Every structure is written in structure tokens, then in C-alpha cells.
Amino acid sequence: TGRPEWIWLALGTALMGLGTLYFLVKGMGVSDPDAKKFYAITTLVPAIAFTMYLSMLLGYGLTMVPFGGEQNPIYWARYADWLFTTPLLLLDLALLVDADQGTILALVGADGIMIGTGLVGALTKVYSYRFVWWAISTAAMLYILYVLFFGFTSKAESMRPEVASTFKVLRNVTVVLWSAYPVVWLIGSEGAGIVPLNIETLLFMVLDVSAKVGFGLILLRSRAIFGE
Amino acid sequence: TGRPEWIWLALGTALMGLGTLYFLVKGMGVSDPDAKKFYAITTLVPAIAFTMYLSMLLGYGLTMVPFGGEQNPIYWARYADWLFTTPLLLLDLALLVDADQGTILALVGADGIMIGTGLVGALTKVYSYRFVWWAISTAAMLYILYVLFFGFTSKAESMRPEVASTFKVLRNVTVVLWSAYPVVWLIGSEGAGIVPLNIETLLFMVLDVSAKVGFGLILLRSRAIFGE
Amino acid sequence: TGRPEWIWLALGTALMGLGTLYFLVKGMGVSDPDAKKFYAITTLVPAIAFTMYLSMLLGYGLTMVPFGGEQNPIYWARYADWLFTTPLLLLDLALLVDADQGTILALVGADGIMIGTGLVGALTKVYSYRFVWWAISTAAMLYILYVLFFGFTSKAESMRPEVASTFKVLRNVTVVLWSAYPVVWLIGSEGAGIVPLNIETLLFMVLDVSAKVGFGLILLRSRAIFGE
Ligand SMILES: CC(C)CCC[C@@H](C)CCC[C@@H](C)CCC[C@@H](C)CCOC[C@@H](CO)OCC[C@H](C)CCC[C@H](C)CCC[C@H](C)CCCC(C)C
Ligand SMILES: CC(C)CCC[C@@H](C)CCC[C@@H](C)CCC[C@@H](C)CCOC[C@@H](CO)OCC[C@H](C)CCC[C@H](C)CCC[C@H](C)CCCC(C)C
Ligand SMILES: CC(C)CCC[C@@H](C)CCC[C@@H](C)CCC[C@@H](C)CCOC[C@@H](CO)OCC[C@H](C)CCC[C@H](C)CCC[C@H](C)CCCC(C)C
Ligand SMILES: CC(C)CCC[C@@H](C)CCC[C@@H](C)CCC[C@@H](C)CCOC[C@@H](CO)OCC[C@H](C)CCC[C@H](C)CCC[C@H](C)CCCC(C)C
Ligand SMILES: CC(C)CCC[C@@H](C)CCC[C@@H](C)CCC[C@@H](C)CCOC[C@@H](CO)OCC[C@H](C)CCC[C@H](C)CCC[C@H](C)CCCC(C)C
Ligand SMILES: CC(C)CCC[C@@H](C)CCC[C@@H](C)CCC[C@@H](C)CCOC[C@@H](CO)OCC[C@H](C)CCC[C@H](C)CCC[C@H](C)CCCC(C)C
Ligand SMILES: *C/C=C(C)/C=C/C=C(C)/C=C/C1=C(C)CCCC1(C)C
Ligand SMILES: *C/C=C(C)/C=C/C=C(C)/C=C/C1=C(C)CCCC1(C)C
Ligand SMILES: *C/C=C(C)/C=C/C=C(C)/C=C/C1=C(C)CCCC1(C)C
């Protein structure tokens, strides 16, 4: 493994794998149907990331994109991961607050646009246009963060204190960690090329494990996930 | 931009972009959960088309398919657009009439078959077989149009007059505009090659903007989208 | 058709096509909304398989994957089929028993992991790593079979005798036929290469037609699909 970023791909694979097994074991026995939804969503998220980390580690999830005069290593498997795991994370938030279905559809669809335009930007061979896709994807992310802070103002007169409390923490966790991903992309291998791929891969590893396994530990340890 | 169809890709990009912003602004403030569903579906549709028009304009959504002795320019991004936006359009219709879930699943699944076989036909290198996929996809479209006219005969004893009225108009808009897409494909660059790609791109632009932004203006201006 | 497996691809195409038309005709007239769900799911399943069998027959769904020193014919279209039809089959089971939504999401997501890791294994160029993906996919299949036997223990105090009976038979049909697919893959063209592709294609044809058209005949002939 002649790619120096292999260690972070291996560590990411192991930590997503271990978080999947932990959440699997923890959700055994659970009969509350509301809690079963949260365990299924929250366990699927690092299970999908485990498979995509492994595909990067083994090289399957890596391709070379010509741009800027250069053959650029691009890990496309990250977008196949995020396509599914970032709407699932939004679904955990949305279920906490009993979101209306129109709000869930706005969130999941804005998130698909965010990930799909991120992927088009990652694979685009004209260097300047990569950053046009980055901006569109960021605009979709900002929409999602707007909805998470301002789209549930009908949900407060009626929201169990423990649901509000856990939703607040997870929403803060989300806004901080997810906002770092466009920055990493912009300065890393896919963007300006200021931070080398080895470091980029480290940064996404720490973000992903926090946003998936850290997030899910907070959620699944709360009694907000059970019907009262 | 040495592709003469660039002007229609640019115009399509702008009109889908402007229709997205208009519907975004128009749906601000809306609290009625039924109306929020219609705004989310109807706003996502031109937002997705904006991204796919832009990918065609920038060249990312174009590939060359050998067939007929020739390297043929094929805009595959149209199928990535339609994969999502044509079930969303069907969902707006189906929600208007309070469709049963089995009818929604038939519609969304027939539509996936329509778009996916359209894409296989667009990328098929044996010329005669392209038209086998065209026929299968047309058969799926005809099924969808059948369901839209004859699959909601339990929904009339109970259907607000304004819902019936808006559903009738949008269903007519749909049947007329969607039926033109197999014809354009059959005579255009993907099919018989009778109409040049520049004109084909113009035709799909006018159809798409009408079927997305025209459709959505009719829907979102009606009080059929609000619970009574 | 210089591929000896063409006959089984042609036969599979015809049998999925004929089963689609039969289920289409059989579900005409059905007004019971619960029954309409089962007809839509169960009819879409062989309709999707018909398109994917046809794409294999015509060669579109075939690619060459280098591994083991060799250019290996890999029918990738099977994974595009299964991506949709295996969650749909699980949905028919889950609706029979009135599964909780968290259980449905676990099933559909485990199934996506099963098919997507199966596809990564089928396309992986390092021979030994193909079998790592096979094992992960098998682990997801075993999870699905676990849930089908042990995830509905809240659903028995309340389950119409005819629903229990039909669910039991279809679940047995599923466990036996689906468990054969990793074995065929492991000994066939995608794995160890012990069984030639011609025979492999025969085996998957018999499995698919049984698991789709055989399964659906059992389901759609039962009164378990109607609300009582
Ligand atoms: C609910 C159910 C009932 C639904 C039923 C399913 C229904 C659709 C029936 C099955 C049809 C279909 C799924 C199967 C055909 C797959 C098709 C894409 C195959 C083409 O790809 C094969 C290759 C190489 O030979 O061609 C070359 C590849 C091309 C150059 C690429 C062109 C294709 C586009 C890239 C498609 C874009 C779609 C994206 C995957 C959408 C998400 C991506 C995003 C978030 C960035
Ligand atoms: C000029 C540029 C270089 C800067 C780029 C910024 C840009 C990308 C936008 C990001 C802003 C965003 C992170 C802020 C949103 C979170 C927070 C401020 C929201 C406040 O509201 C929530 C409150 C109360 O419930 O809790 C508060 C929740 C938390 C306690 C808020 C704490 C914020 C985080 C601690 C900051 C993230 C830390 C990084 C992940 C560390 C990486 C840096 C590295 C080089 C060591
Ligand atoms: C709800 C959630 C819990 C679900 C969890 C997600 C779960 C599936 C886990 C993730 C696995 C998976 C999504 C990730 C792997 C992606 C896989 C397709 C990668 C293969 O493609 C990489 C390339 C180049 O190196 O190979 C060469 C490319 C090949 C030649 C092409 C073969 C692949 C097929 C084309 C696949 C067909 C699927 C279609 C996109 C379906 C729709 C298309 C249609 C409508 C026309
Ligand atoms: C032989 C071939 C060349 C012809 C190909 C036809 C074939 C592809 C099938 C298409 C038929 C389809 C469009 C008809 C369905 C719509 C309509 C007749 C349905 C009637 O029922 C609805 C009624 C009452 O509510 O309103 C009625 C709704 C509307 C008022 C109906 C009006 C029909 C449209 C005005 C026709 C479409 C116009 C084109 C988009 C213009 C493009 C032509 C260009 C060259 C100028
Ligand atoms: C609900 C709605 C509102 C949602 C709105 C949709 C929203 C996402 C907006 C549309 C964006 C997007 C869908 C369109 C862009 C498609 C994008 C994949 C195009 C890239 O592919 C083009 C090629 C050749 O030029 O590049 C080369 C190809 C690369 C080498 C491959 C890299 C891409 C990955 C393979 C993507 C993996 C995703 C898988 C299809 C997931 C399932 C596969 C699995 C089960 C094995
Ligand atoms: C060492 C290896 C080579 C063996 C590999 C096995 C491995 C892949 C795991 C598979 C085990 C699995 C098929 C068993 C599950 C089914 C069954 C035993 C479950 C019992 O519980 C259900 C009961 C009561 O309702 O009905 C019972 C339901 C049925 C009546 C059970 C009958 C089992 C099937 C008849 C066996 C499958 C037959 C094959 C499809 C035939 C192909 C062989 C060919 C070479 C002729
Ligand atoms: C599980 C992994 C998580 C939570 C990942 C989140 C990823 C994003 C918020 C990605 C955002 C991006 C942009 C806004 C701009 C373009 C680059 C992306 C895709 C990295
Ligand atoms: C937003 C864009 C809309 C409403 C597009 C609709 C597209 C169709 C109805 C496409 C149909 C096709 C056929 C029936 C045959 C094969 C060619 C297609 C995909 C163009
Ligand atoms: C309609 C076709 C059906 C029911 C197909 C089922 C396919 C599976 C159960 C496939 C399973 C696989 C594994 C568990 C290991 C990797 C190889 C696969 C994808 C064939």
C-alpha cells in the first residue's frame, strides 16, 4: 500500500465497522417501533460507510481524473457513501422532530442535489468548472442547514423536552461537521490542491467517523428515540 | 462553444434556474403541510433540471456513442434528470387525487422503467436495437398515461371540485407534453437522425421548461394544494 | 449469438415478459388498496427483470473485467435488476406481516448493501478481493434472512391465519432460492470459475424465474393480499 493515505482508509474502515457492530448489538431486543426506526437508520449509516471505506482502501473506489495538466486521484466512492448516508442522517433529525413530509422531501432532495453536484464537480475535467459545481453544492448545503434551523417552527409548541434537547445537540453536531466538508474539498485534492491527499483523507476520516459514529452514539443513548 | 446547441442549453439552464428561484421564494411562509409537499416536489423538479442542463452546457453530460458507422453525441444527463424529475411530477399528480399507495408505486416504477430503458436505448451501440428499447420505454409511458386517465375511478365520489379541476388540467398538460418526448427522440440524434441535434435540443428545452416550470406555475397558483 | 448462454438469456427474457403480462392482466379490476400494493410490487418485479434479461441477451448488460490473468465476461445488468427487484420482493413480505417501518428500512438497506457489494465484487480486478466483497454481501443476506425469521415476533398475536400461512410459504421460498445465489456466484464466472458461464446463466435463470414469477404466482393467488 504505496498510497500514503492507506492508513486513514484502514482506520476509517475499522472504525465504521466497529461502530456498525456496536449499534447492531445495541439495538437488539428493541421493540418500540419509533426506536426501531432510529436504530435501523443509524446502524445502516456506518454500515454503508464501512463498505465505501473498504472500497477506497482496496482501490476500487479510486479513479484518475485529468484536470489542471495532471492525472488526479479522486476517491469517487465517497459520493456513493454520502448519497445514501447523508439523507439517512437528515431522516434521523427529521423523525426526532416529527417533521412534515414536505420538509423531509425538501431535505432529502436538496441533499441529493448536494451530493450529485459534488460528484459532478469531483469528476469534471475542466478545472475552473469544478468550482462552479462546488458552489452549487454548497448552496444546497446552506439550504439544508437553513431548513434544520428554521423549518420546524410549528414543532415547538409540541415537542417533548427530551426530543428538543437531543434534536438541538444533533443539529449542532451536524451543522458544524457538515460545514467542514466543502472547506476540505475546496483546499484538497479535488479543489485547489493546497492540502495533500494524505491529509485530506485524514480530515474526511475524522469528520465521517464523528458525523456517523459520534452522531449515532449521541442519538441511540437518548430516550428521545422511544415513543413515550 | 462550438456546439451549436449551446444556446438552448444555456437558455434551458437559465429558465430552470429562474423557475427554481421563483418557486423557492413563492413557497416561503407556507405552513399548510399538504401545500408544503407540493412546493417541495415542485421546486425540486426544476432545481434538478437546472443542474442537468448546466452539466450539458459545460459538456460533462455529453458522451459519444458509436452506432451507425459514426460517433454520435448523446446527452446522457437528460436521463439522470428525468430519473428523478418525472416520478416527482407523477407524485404531484398522485397526491392531488389522494392516490392509493399501490397506484403511486405502479406509476413511479413504470416511470423508472421508461427512463432506464430510454437510457439503455440512448447508449446502445447496435443501431436497430436502439429502437427496441424505444418501444419498451414507450409502452411504459403508455401505461403511465393509462393509469393517469383510468386508475383513479374510486377518487371521484370524493374529490374537492378544485382538486378535480387542477388535476384535470395538469393531467392534460402532462399527456400532451410527455407524449412528444418519444417522438423527438425517434426523429432526433438518438434515433433516426432526421432532425439535427441543434433542433432536437431546442425541442427538449421547450418541452422541459413547459413540463416543469409551466406545470409548476399551474399547480402552485391553485388552492388545490392546500388542505381545506 | 456466439455466446452459448444466449438461450438461457432468451428464455429468461420470455418468461419474465410473459409473467409480467400475466400479472398485469390478473391485477386488472382490483380495487382493494392493499391488494393493489401487492399487484404493483409483484408486477414491477418481473417487468424490471424482463428489461435486464433483454439487456443481457442483446449484449448491453455484459462487460469484460480483467482479473486472474484473463478478460472475464461479467453480466453487470443482473445487479441493476436486483437493486430494485430484491427490495421489492422484501417489501411484499414485509407488507404481508404489517412490518414496522424500522424493520422495512433495515431490510431494504441491508438488501442494498448486499447488491451493491455484490456488484463491487463482480467488477473488482484483484481476484482475491472479489471474495472479500462476496463475504460482506453474504453477511448482509444472512442478516436479511435473520430478520425474516426472527424480526416479526410482535406480529403473531395479530396476524390473520391466511396472512401467516402465505407469509410462511413465501418466506421459505425466499430463504431457499436466495441462499443459492451466493453459491452460484462463488462457483461461477464471477468467483472460482468452476462452473462455466453457460451453466451459471442457466442456474440464475431458473432461480430468478422461480423467485419472481413463481413467488408472485403464490402471492397473487392468495386472499392474504386483500384487506378483510
Ligand atoms: C422502483 C423501481 C420499480 C424502479 C425500476 C428500475 C427501472 C429503472 C428499470 C431498470 C433500468 C435501469 C435501472 C437499468 C439500466 C442501467 C443503465 C444506467 C445502464 C447504463 O450503464 C452501462 C454503461 C457501460 O456499458 O454505459 C455507459 C454509462 C453512461 C456513460 C452513463 C449514463 C447514465 C447516467 C450516469 C445515469 C445517471 C443516474 C444517476 C446514477 C443518478 C444518481 C447520481 C448522482 C446522485 C450524482
Ligand atoms: C474563515 C474560514 C476559514 C472559516 C470557515 C467557516 C465556514 C465553513 C462556516 C462554518 C460555521 C459553522 C461551523 C458554525 C455553526 C455552529 C455554531 C456556530 C452554531 C451555533 O448554534 C448552536 C449552539 C447552541 O445550541 O451551539 C453551538 C455548537 C458548537 C459548540 C459550535 C462550535 C463550532 C466548532 C467548535 C467549530 C468547528 C471546529 C472544527 C471542526 C475544527 C477543525 C480546525 C482544525 C484546523 C484544527
Ligand atoms: C437505502 C440505503 C440504506 C442503501 C444503501 C446503499 C448500499 C447499496 C451500499 C453502497 C453500495 C453501492 C451503492 C456503492 C458501489 C457503487 C458501484 C455501482 C460502483 C461501481 O462503479 C465503478 C466503476 C468504475 O471504477 O466500474 C464500472 C461500472 C460498471 C461497468 C457498471 C455496472 C453497475 C450498474 C450500471 C448498476 C446499475 C444501477 C443503476 C444506476 C440503476 C438506475 C439506472 C437506470 C434508471 C437506467
Ligand atoms: C401522426 C403523428 C405525427 C402524431 C403523433 C401523436 C402521438 C405522439 C400521440 C400524442 C397524442 C396526445 C398529444 C393527445 C392527448 C391530449 C388530448 C388529445 C387528450 C384529450 O383529453 C383532455 C381534454 C379534456 O380535459 O383536453 C385536451 C388537452 C389539450 C388541449 C389537447 C391538445 C393537443 C396538443 C395541442 C397537441 C400537442 C402540440 C405540440 C406540442 C406542438 C408541436 C408541433 C410542432 C411541429 C409545431
Ligand atoms: C429525490 C430527488 C429530489 C434527488 C435529486 C437528484 C440529485 C442527485 C440531482 C442530480 C445529480 C445527479 C443524480 C446527476 C449526475 C450523475 C453523475 C453520477 C454523473 C457521473 O457519471 C458520468 C461519467 C462519464 O462522463 O463519469 C465517470 C463515472 C464515475 C467514475 C463513477 C462515480 C460515480 C459513482 C459510481 C456513484 C455511485 C452511486 C451508485 C449508483 C449507488 C448505487 C450503486 C450500488 C447499489 C452498487
Ligand atoms: C454444503 C453446501 C453445498 C450446501 C449449501 C447450503 C447453504 C447455501 C445454506 C442454504 C440453506 C437453506 C436453503 C435452508 C433454508 C430452508 C429450510 C431448511 C428452512 C426450514 O424452515 C421452513 C420450513 C417450515 O415452514 O419449510 C422448509 C422449506 C423448504 C421445503 C426447505 C427445502 C430446502 C430445499 C429443497 C433445498 C434447495 C434445493 C436447490 C435449489 C436445488 C439445487 C441443487 C442442484 C445441484 C440440483
Ligand atoms: C457521512 C458523511 C457526511 C455527513 C458527509 C457530508 C458531506 C457534505 C456536507 C458534503 C458537502 C460538499 C459541498 C457542500 C460542496 C461540494 C463538496 C462536498 C460534496 C464535499
Ligand atoms: C422533465 C422532463 C419530462 C417531463 C420528461 C419526460 C420524458 C419522457 C416522457 C420520455 C420518454 C421516452 C420514451 C417514451 C421513449 C424512449 C425515449 C424517451 C426516454 C425520451
Ligand atoms: C430476483 C432475483 C433475486 C431474488 C436475486 C437474489 C440475489 C441474491 C440473494 C444475491 C446474493 C449475493 C450474495 C449474498 C453474495 C455476492 C453475490 C450475490 C450478489 C449473488
Tab-separated table of C-alpha atoms in Angstrom, chain A residues 25-228:
chain	number	residue	atom	x	y	z
A	25	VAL	CA	-25.730	-5.253	19.127
A	26	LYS	CA	-27.152	-2.260	20.983
A	27	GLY	CA	-30.385	-2.338	19.005
A	28	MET	CA	-31.043	-5.994	19.655
A	29	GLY	CA	-34.071	-6.510	21.743
A	30	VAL	CA	-35.624	-3.142	20.890
A	31	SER	CA	-39.372	-3.443	20.359
A	32	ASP	CA	-40.515	0.217	20.426
A	33	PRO	CA	-41.352	0.892	16.748
A	34	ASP	CA	-40.123	4.522	16.928
A	35	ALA	CA	-36.827	3.325	18.419
A	36	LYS	CA	-36.545	0.605	15.798
A	37	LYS	CA	-36.624	3.312	13.075
A	38	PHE	CA	-33.788	5.231	14.686
A	39	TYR	CA	-31.680	2.078	15.220
A	40	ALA	CA	-32.193	0.956	11.590
A	41	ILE	CA	-31.311	4.352	10.105
A	42	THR	CA	-28.415	4.876	12.475
A	43	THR	CA	-26.915	1.421	12.056
A	44	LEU	CA	-27.202	1.482	8.215
A	45	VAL	CA	-25.226	4.742	8.088
A	46	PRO	CA	-21.807	3.400	9.292
A	47	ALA	CA	-22.516	0.016	7.571
A	48	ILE	CA	-22.668	1.810	4.213
A	49	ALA	CA	-19.636	3.900	5.134
A	50	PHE	CA	-17.735	0.764	6.114
A	51	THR	CA	-18.289	-0.681	2.600
A	52	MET	CA	-17.207	2.534	0.917
A	53	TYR	CA	-14.110	2.995	3.090
A	54	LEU	CA	-13.177	-0.566	2.281
A	55	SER	CA	-13.645	0.102	-1.447
A	56	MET	CA	-11.285	3.075	-1.147
A	57	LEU	CA	-8.755	1.059	0.858
A	58	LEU	CA	-8.771	-1.717	-1.794
A	59	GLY	CA	-8.526	0.808	-4.639
A	60	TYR	CA	-11.883	0.106	-6.265
A	61	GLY	CA	-13.292	3.446	-5.132
A	62	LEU	CA	-10.412	5.494	-6.635
A	63	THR	CA	-10.274	6.866	-10.182
A	64	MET	CA	-7.910	9.253	-12.041
A	65	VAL	CA	-9.437	12.466	-13.330
A	66	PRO	CA	-7.422	14.602	-15.757
A	67	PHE	CA	-7.557	18.221	-14.895
A	68	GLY	CA	-5.111	21.002	-14.408
A	69	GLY	CA	-2.459	19.277	-16.587
A	70	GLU	CA	-2.343	16.248	-14.302
A	71	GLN	CA	-3.820	12.868	-13.544
A	72	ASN	CA	-5.612	13.486	-10.240
A	73	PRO	CA	-6.538	10.722	-7.778
A	74	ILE	CA	-10.219	11.121	-6.965
A	75	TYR	CA	-11.963	8.881	-4.458
A	76	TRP	CA	-15.444	8.720	-6.055
A	77	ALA	CA	-16.634	6.152	-3.531
A	78	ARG	CA	-17.188	8.925	-1.010
A	79	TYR	CA	-20.125	10.181	-3.150
A	80	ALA	CA	-21.727	6.723	-3.285
A	81	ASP	CA	-21.452	6.630	0.512
A	82	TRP	CA	-22.851	10.116	1.049
A	83	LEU	CA	-25.690	9.681	-1.497
A	84	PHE	CA	-27.309	7.329	0.968
A	85	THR	CA	-25.851	8.168	4.362
A	86	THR	CA	-26.399	11.932	4.336
A	87	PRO	CA	-30.195	11.634	3.640
A	88	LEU	CA	-30.369	8.922	6.293
A	89	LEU	CA	-28.707	11.301	8.818
A	90	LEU	CA	-31.209	14.004	7.860
A	91	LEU	CA	-34.016	11.458	8.295
A	92	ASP	CA	-32.926	10.777	11.896
A	93	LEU	CA	-33.143	14.511	12.573
A	94	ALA	CA	-36.472	14.903	10.825
A	95	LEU	CA	-38.065	11.974	12.649
A	96	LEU	CA	-36.932	13.356	16.009
A	97	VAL	CA	-38.976	16.452	15.409
A	98	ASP	CA	-41.885	14.764	13.689
A	99	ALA	CA	-41.231	16.769	10.536
A	100	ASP	CA	-43.928	17.223	7.943
A	101	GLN	CA	-43.407	15.056	4.869
A	102	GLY	CA	-42.912	18.109	2.636
A	103	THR	CA	-39.977	19.163	4.831
A	104	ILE	CA	-38.468	15.656	4.662
A	105	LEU	CA	-38.720	15.687	0.880
A	106	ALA	CA	-37.093	19.094	0.659
A	107	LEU	CA	-34.246	17.908	2.865
A	108	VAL	CA	-33.638	14.577	1.082
A	109	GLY	CA	-33.902	16.203	-2.360
A	110	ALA	CA	-31.613	19.140	-1.512
A	111	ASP	CA	-29.174	16.608	-0.112
A	112	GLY	CA	-29.268	14.572	-3.347
A	113	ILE	CA	-28.529	17.710	-5.278
A	114	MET	CA	-25.646	18.483	-2.882
A	115	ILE	CA	-24.056	15.057	-3.321
A	116	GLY	CA	-24.708	14.697	-7.013
A	117	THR	CA	-23.300	18.115	-7.869
A	118	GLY	CA	-20.361	17.348	-5.566
A	119	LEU	CA	-19.733	14.221	-7.622
A	120	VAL	CA	-20.025	16.045	-10.934
A	121	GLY	CA	-17.526	18.638	-9.598
A	122	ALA	CA	-15.195	15.837	-8.448
A	123	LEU	CA	-15.166	14.239	-11.918
A	124	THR	CA	-15.129	17.422	-14.056
A	125	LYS	CA	-12.073	17.703	-16.348
A	126	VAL	CA	-12.209	21.498	-16.861
A	127	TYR	CA	-10.540	22.830	-13.720
A	128	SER	CA	-12.423	26.160	-13.330
A	129	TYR	CA	-15.810	24.482	-13.718
A	130	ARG	CA	-15.115	22.162	-10.786
A	131	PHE	CA	-15.654	25.146	-8.524
A	132	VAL	CA	-18.969	26.071	-10.164
A	133	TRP	CA	-20.271	22.651	-9.067
A	134	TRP	CA	-18.717	23.193	-5.631
A	135	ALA	CA	-20.692	26.456	-5.282
A	136	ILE	CA	-23.994	24.898	-6.349
A	137	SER	CA	-23.457	22.022	-3.947
A	138	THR	CA	-22.608	24.495	-1.118
A	139	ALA	CA	-25.781	26.411	-1.886
A	140	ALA	CA	-27.756	23.160	-1.438
A	141	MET	CA	-25.927	22.506	1.869
A	142	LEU	CA	-26.767	26.003	3.064
A	143	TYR	CA	-30.418	25.335	2.176
A	144	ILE	CA	-30.345	22.158	4.268
A	145	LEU	CA	-28.775	23.983	7.199
A	146	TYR	CA	-31.404	26.733	6.840
A	147	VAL	CA	-34.247	24.213	6.997
A	148	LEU	CA	-32.722	22.461	10.034
A	149	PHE	CA	-32.689	25.787	11.947
A	150	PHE	CA	-35.788	27.483	10.656
A	151	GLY	CA	-38.099	24.822	9.030
A	152	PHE	CA	-39.566	23.311	12.244
A	153	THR	CA	-41.232	26.415	13.917
A	154	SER	CA	-44.562	24.572	14.083
A	155	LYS	CA	-42.957	21.712	16.031
A	156	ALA	CA	-42.083	23.564	19.240
A	157	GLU	CA	-45.464	24.028	20.917
A	158	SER	CA	-45.484	20.177	20.720
A	159	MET	CA	-42.111	18.562	21.206
A	160	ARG	CA	-41.157	16.527	24.305
A	161	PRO	CA	-38.355	18.288	26.177
A	162	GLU	CA	-36.074	15.336	25.630
A	163	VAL	CA	-36.769	15.272	21.949
A	164	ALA	CA	-35.994	19.021	21.709
A	165	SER	CA	-32.825	18.599	23.670
A	166	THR	CA	-31.425	15.730	21.655
A	167	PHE	CA	-32.519	17.308	18.419
A	168	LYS	CA	-30.652	20.540	19.371
A	169	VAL	CA	-27.423	18.752	20.093
A	170	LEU	CA	-27.505	16.597	16.991
A	171	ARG	CA	-28.423	19.560	14.863
A	172	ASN	CA	-25.421	21.471	16.193
A	173	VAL	CA	-23.174	18.477	15.598
A	174	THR	CA	-24.469	18.315	12.048
A	175	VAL	CA	-24.062	21.994	11.201
A	176	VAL	CA	-20.501	22.124	12.461
A	177	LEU	CA	-19.211	18.872	10.951
A	178	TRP	CA	-21.076	19.074	7.627
A	179	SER	CA	-19.940	22.669	7.052
A	180	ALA	CA	-16.335	21.456	7.162
A	181	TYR	CA	-16.723	19.117	4.185
A	182	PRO	CA	-16.901	21.858	1.463
A	183	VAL	CA	-13.887	23.504	3.014
A	184	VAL	CA	-11.835	20.273	2.964
A	185	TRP	CA	-12.886	19.625	-0.639
A	186	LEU	CA	-12.037	23.196	-1.698
A	187	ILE	CA	-8.468	23.120	-0.281
A	188	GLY	CA	-7.849	19.400	-1.006
A	189	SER	CA	-7.133	17.154	-3.952
A	190	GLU	CA	-10.472	17.736	-5.605
A	191	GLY	CA	-10.194	21.536	-5.470
A	192	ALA	CA	-7.267	23.942	-5.087
A	193	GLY	CA	-4.750	21.236	-4.197
A	194	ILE	CA	-3.392	23.182	-1.166
A	195	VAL	CA	-3.667	20.227	1.240
A	196	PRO	CA	-2.276	16.911	0.037
A	197	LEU	CA	-4.480	13.903	-0.465
A	198	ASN	CA	-2.970	12.112	2.512
A	199	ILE	CA	-4.078	14.916	4.830
A	200	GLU	CA	-7.393	15.355	3.078
A	201	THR	CA	-8.143	11.680	3.605
A	202	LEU	CA	-7.311	12.083	7.303
A	203	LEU	CA	-9.664	15.060	7.604
A	204	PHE	CA	-12.591	13.308	5.908
A	205	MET	CA	-11.961	10.218	8.103
A	206	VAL	CA	-12.231	12.237	11.313
A	207	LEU	CA	-15.295	14.109	10.014
A	208	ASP	CA	-17.040	10.947	8.772
A	209	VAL	CA	-16.470	8.954	11.947
A	210	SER	CA	-17.691	11.869	14.038
A	211	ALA	CA	-20.707	12.625	11.862
A	212	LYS	CA	-21.783	8.939	11.726
A	213	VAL	CA	-20.497	7.042	14.759
A	214	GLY	CA	-20.228	10.091	17.078
A	215	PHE	CA	-23.686	11.345	15.992
A	216	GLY	CA	-25.187	7.885	16.349
A	217	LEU	CA	-23.803	7.360	19.860
A	218	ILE	CA	-25.481	10.589	20.942
A	219	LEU	CA	-28.782	9.657	19.346
A	220	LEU	CA	-29.029	5.996	20.404
A	221	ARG	CA	-28.144	6.730	24.017
A	222	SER	CA	-31.066	9.148	24.368
A	223	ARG	CA	-34.588	8.284	25.441
A	224	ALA	CA	-35.767	10.684	22.714
A	225	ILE	CA	-35.785	7.719	20.353
A	226	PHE	CA	-38.639	5.936	22.190
A	227	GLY	CA	-42.299	6.646	21.991
A	228	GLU	CA	-43.312	7.909	25.423
